Amino acid sequence: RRNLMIVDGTNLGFRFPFASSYVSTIQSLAKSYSARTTIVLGDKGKSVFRLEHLPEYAFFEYLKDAFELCKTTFPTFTIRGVEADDMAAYIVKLIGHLYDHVWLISTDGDWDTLLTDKVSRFSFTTRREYHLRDMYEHHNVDDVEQFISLKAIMGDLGDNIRGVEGIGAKRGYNIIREFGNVLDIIDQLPLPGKQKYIQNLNASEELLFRNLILVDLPTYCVDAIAAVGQDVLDKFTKDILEIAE
Template identity: 30%
Template sequence: MLVDGMALLFRGYYATAYRGYIMKTSAGVPTNAIYGFVKYMWDAIQTFEPSHVICCWDMGSKTFRTELYDQYKANRGAPPEELVPQFDLVKEVVSSFDIPNIGIEQFEADDCIGSLAKRYSAEMHVQILTGDHDSLQLVTDRVHSIIMKKGMSNYEVYTPEKLLEEKGLTPAQMIDLKGLMGDTSDNFPGVKGIGEKTAIKLLKEYATIEAIIENLEKLPKGMRTKIESELDMLHLSRQLAEIRCDVPIECVVEDALLTIDAGKVRKQFETLEFNKLLKEMGIH
């Protein structure tokens, strides 16, 4: 199981912070995001029973994508103040489970997940735990995406068949879909005036962006004009949308074998005053 660390951490933070309640230790260290993170990760481990687990992280806002397009994710504000000290602390918690933390400068967690999924799926079944639909482009017969939905223990597992049934598209076409319609959360525009419905219709008919461009003269004049005037942005948006699967990561699969040392976890949890969670997880 490849865990999208940031997705779980932010989800853990907002699950409690929206009520204005930030859990803190007696020393005043905020821990609500970590608490939520552990609950989500542990629930997924209990539900899907992976033999190996790796947690992947973003390493700051500067990546090869921001070099390609300086407005990439520029719409995102600074993280909430109470969340900042939890970024490093959560990695210590992950380490206490003997789960490797992976993050590579200039790349996003998604690129690490894509690269590890490609590498490990040659020899084993891979599950990606995330809240992010971008991961659907990585789905194969050996790589499934577990999308976390609202609440605990609420998952949607995507296989190539499930994706085809729901969207009518293949995993590879999910990249072209984002290229055409853009992505408001990552702040790149795609082709102005082309939304999801139109993009899916075009891809069902022509399969790829390349084939759409080759058949521009067959498109209605308005649509053709939109694409022709945004060709550069279309290609750039597709490049930004594609998860890299060639990131040089040093991680031996044996290091990811899930063997929990209760003593290590207990010590870490006692520091964070997660006594109730220890009981809930059955760690003595």
């Protein structure tokens, strides 16, 4: 009736022919989350935007059938060279105002950089719902700005994103609480401290800068979609605006 639902399609596929079960699961979620609008996203190709900044950055036929069936029921988007993460981030900032709440269907913690008091996430893996109010319980940070900065400092080895040595969630969070976000920290470099991790941090200016671009979804989502063409960005913008009426 009044919410927006965004589905991390490929991610949902990993939970499972299953095309029928896939679309039904979504129809069922749209019902339980009162979505008057549901947009299913998919991952096609590799993130052009992230690859140009980090060259080493990071069933399938049935999943294709699932997406084909999905298109006949819900607006479904797959933009080659653009991650579902960026389209989700962009959809939220563009038409999020038009809804009471936005529900993200994804088991990907990176999607929590999109959280606000009106943007939450549901995970099939844990069955948990992720609200901004519980950011500490789920990420050892108090808010989204801190989650983004900590990700930039620590990095994600799974995505081949190196981080600052010796800095974990605890040290990073305390470094963030005392000196602010990543850009604030960079501007204050070097930071006082005899500890090795502080020294490593002081020699990481460019790493922190590069990492921020790779992990700060809301800020770079528009650039990430435009990395494959302004025309493709315009068509996407036109499509989501038409959907929102």
